[PDB]
Design a protein around this ligand. Structure first.
Ligand SMILES: CC(C)(O)C(=O)Nc1ccc([N+](=O)[O-])c(C(F)(F)F)c1
Lengths: 9, 242
């Protein structure tokens, strides 16, 4: 979800 | 002294709970701040870990995984130094704007767990824990919990963790006397971590009804990764058994 997104910013 | 130069150079700053300190100590308001604090302090682990000596050595899924699990244990450990260093261990120094008093300890309904945290905070004291000793134990804490099926590459991981002991082992180095104590403390962490992990999870389910606000990412980690731990899928690596 939203953690893996935080892992490309 | 290169290893150390790094832990401190990467070492986060002071995160604020962003808390309306005017509102009286309500179970909802208190915990709707801790949730943001969880969130904010999580962002900061995300960034801190990314910069660890050979962190990008690990698998990217493993990287996320280890952070997702450790997150808590770290926040607790760091928080206890925060309390120890800033309040001499009198209260629980979560953020500048969220210091926990007996009454706040009681009002969040987290009293037992706080007794635990004031406790381990008290330990930094009773054990004359150096900052270079604290920093090292905290880095190492990231490598203190795994899934039981193992990581996408356990190999490259075990490698990592093993060299984070030799490091703390070098930072210590009749040294064995000290060693034990520190590995002991580093264990006291997980028991507590798991208690908040349980507290947090209970909350998430009933948050709909106790009016306590979880950020999107907070709920997700608690909804999808924390259960893994609670269900015994993911277990922490203790030094001594226990
Ligand atoms: C989301 C849940 C209840 O708030 C939670 O883990 N609380 C929380 C929040 C922040 C911090 N912190 O270190 O600043 C901690 C704790 F690590 F002390 F336990 C717990």
């Amino acid at each position: 979800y939203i953690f893996d997104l935080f892992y490309k910013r | 002294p290169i290893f150390l130069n790094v832990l401190e150079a990467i070492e986060p700053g002071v995160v604020c709970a962003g808390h309306d300190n005017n509102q009286p100590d309500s179970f909802a308001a208190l915990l709707s701040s801790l949730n943001e604090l969880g969130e904010r302090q999580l962002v900061h682990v995300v960034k801190w870990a990314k910069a660890l000596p050979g962190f990008r050595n690990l698998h990217v899924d493993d990287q996320m995984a280890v952070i997702q699990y450790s997150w808590m244990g770290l926040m607790v450990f760091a928080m206890g130094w925060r309390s120890f260093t800033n309040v001499n261990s009198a209260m629980l120094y979560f953020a500048p704007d969220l210091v926990f008093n007996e009454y706040r300890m009681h009002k969040s309904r987290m009293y037992s767990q706080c007794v635990r945290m004031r406790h381990l905070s008290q330990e930094f004291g009773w054990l004359q824990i150096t900052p270079q000793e604290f920093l090292c134990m905290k880095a190492l804490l990231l490598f203190s919990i795994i899934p039981v099926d193992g990581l996408k590459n356990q190999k490259f991981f075990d490698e990592l963790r093993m060299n984070y002991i030799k490091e703390l082992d070098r930072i210590i180095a009749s040294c064995s006397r000290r060693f034990y104590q520190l590995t002991k403390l580093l264990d006291s962490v997980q028991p507590i971590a798991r208690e908040l992990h349980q507290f947090a999870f209970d909350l998430l389910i009933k948050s709909h009804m106790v009016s306590v606000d979880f950020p999107e990412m907070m709920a997700e980690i608690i909804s999808v990764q924390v259960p893994k731990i609670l269900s015994g899928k993911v277990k922490p690596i203790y030094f001594h058994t226990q």
